[PDB]
């Protein structure tokens, strides 16, 4: 039966070929005759050739339908692959007949899912460009299959990601997220955007297409798989969304999600908020206005020693406690929502270096508010900051530990101490811990930012006569005179102030 029809498929008369195509299709519908077609590598080559070369609507439907039935089995998937069926199927994607299109996209889906070598074959056949072009179709079930194909092709393949970008992929995918409500489609499209959102080229494009706001629409959808993929993609994109506006709604939802029972939801919300509030005074304002400080302190308390939650949450708190209209109110709110004890706790083991760095920065900002000077002292912040500083300095003098340079710890701790030293009782504590020798040694640091905070803390201390004499006794006049000529105006200003107080 099989070689008879293979001879009729290779006929010079196309009429004979058309009649043979309808017969081969009906045979693919039964299991006995289907395995017969799959066992013959000469029959499968004829079906592929018939499909690619036919100009007849029915023959294209029957040859594509036949190949679809083979794709249900491992033997048939291997047959279509070895018979060069992938480029033939790709050609069928330009078909104005829906039934031909639906056979091709589903067969290609099956090949991409279970057949080795198929992802490379589809790329080489120009499949990516054809698939991106079809994203203007309005059938949500077809769109769901097409987008899933793009996900398979883009995953772990920076080449494919770049092609999707060039073909207007980001804009088309964002449109789907703004236009449809069909969950299965929203979810598959969000998975494509997730894959693309780790690409340094695709990321600014997705953000420019309005991807942050589009993904924000679906954060309260009942579907948890859709919410989570939106959250992952949002986190990936969030470091490139600094200039975006129309973010009020997203920012409000993210604060709400901080109270979620899902730790993955909490982690992502904290991380997105952290990125979006980094040096964006308008976003800082919005997050504070919708109860962001309270939400973040509660998050830090509940998270305990889970640093995947506390690190982004503490970073967000650091951003929200400086350089915006409501910064003062936020500094106070951290105290009023019982946050100061837990913030000091995070300076201690088992906290790793990324979290310690963030916590020190937050304490530095908290100390800008005088009402936090005494509670920070009472909660034990000064001795721990000094211990951190002393050891960090030693580590630099001997020589990235957990991605963090110990210079960053020196600068951070000295900076926090510089701000805490505005209070008279804090200066007593700082001086009593024998810090002046270390602060004077820091004047000789190659790093200008360290010289600035070291000079600043010495400047605060020297306002008390006893401390000024100790600073002088440490031979500080020599480094300080040299620092008067620093290209850093902050260093030079502070050095002059210390020298002044040492001369009376």
């Amino acid at each position: 039966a099989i070689p008879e029809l293979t001879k009729l498929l290779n006929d010079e008369d196309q009429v004979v070929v058309n009649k043979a195509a309808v017969m081969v299709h009906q045979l693919s519908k039964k299991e006995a005759s289907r395995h017969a077609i799959m066992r013959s590598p000469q029959m499968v080559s004829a079906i592929v050739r018939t499909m690619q070369n036919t100009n007849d609507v029915e023959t294209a439907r029957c040859t594509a339908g036949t190949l679809h039935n083979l794709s249900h089995h491992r033997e048939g998937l291997l047959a279509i692959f070895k018979s060069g069926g992938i480029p033939a199927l790709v050609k069928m994607l330009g078909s104005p007949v829906d039934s031909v299109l639906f056979y091709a996209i589903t067969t290609l889906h099956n090949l991409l899912l279970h057949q080795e070598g198929a992802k490379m074959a589809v790329r080489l056949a120009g499949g990516l460009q054809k698939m991106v072009a079809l994203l203007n179709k309005t059938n949500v079930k077809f769109l769901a299959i097409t987008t899933d194909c793009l996900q398979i092709l883009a995953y772990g393949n920076q080449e494919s990601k770049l092609i999707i970008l060039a073909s207007g992929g980001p804009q088309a995918l964002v449109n789907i997220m703004r236009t449809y409500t069909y969950e299965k489609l929203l979810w598959t499209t969000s998975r494509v955007l997730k894959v693309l959102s780790v690409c340094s080229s695709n990321k600014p494009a997705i953000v420019e297409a309005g991807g942050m706001q589009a993904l924000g629409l679906h954060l309260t959808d009942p579907s948890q798989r859709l919410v989570q993929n939106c959250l992952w993609t949002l986190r990936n994109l969030s470091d490139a969304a600094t200039k975006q506006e129309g973010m009020e709604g997203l920012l409000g939802t993210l604060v709400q999600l901080l109270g979620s029972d899902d730790i993955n939801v909490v982690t992502c919300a904290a991380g997105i908020l952290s990125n979006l509030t980094c040096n964006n005074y308008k976003n800082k304002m919005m997050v504070c206005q919708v109860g962001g400080i309270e939400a973040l302190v509660r998050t830090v308390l509940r998270a305990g020693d889970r640093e995947d939650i506390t690190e982004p949450a503490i970073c967000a708190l650091r951003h929200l406690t400086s350089r915006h209209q409501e910064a003062e109110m936020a500094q106070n709110a951290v105290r009023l929502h019982y946050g100061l004890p837990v913030v000091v706790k995070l300076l201690h083991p088992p906290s790793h270096w990324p979290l310690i760095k963030a916590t020190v920065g937050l304490i530095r900002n908290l100390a800008l508010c005088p009402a936090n000077h005494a509670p920070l002292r009472e909660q034990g912040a000064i001795p721990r900051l000094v211990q951190l500083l002393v050891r960090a300095h030693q580590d630099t003098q001997r020589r990235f530990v957990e991605g963090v340079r110990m210079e960053e710890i020196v600068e951070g701790c000295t900076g926090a101490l510089h701000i805490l030293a505005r209070d008279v009782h804090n200066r007593i504590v700082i001086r009593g811990l024998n810090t002046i020798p270390l602060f004077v040694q820091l004047l000789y640091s190659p790093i200008e930012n360290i010289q600035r905070v070291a000079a600043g803390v010495l400047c605060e201390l020297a306002q008390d006569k006893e401390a000024a004499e100790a600073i002088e006794a440490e031979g500080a006049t020599a480094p300080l005179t040299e620092l008067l000529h620093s290209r850093n105006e902050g260093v030079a200003t502070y050095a002059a102030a210390v020298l002044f107080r040492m001369s009376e």
Binding site: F102, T106, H109, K141, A144, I145, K184
Partner: peptide, 11 residues
Amino acid sequence: XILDXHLXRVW
């Protein structure tokens, strides 16, 4: 019909 059938099979 092919679409419904395929959706069910895959997901």
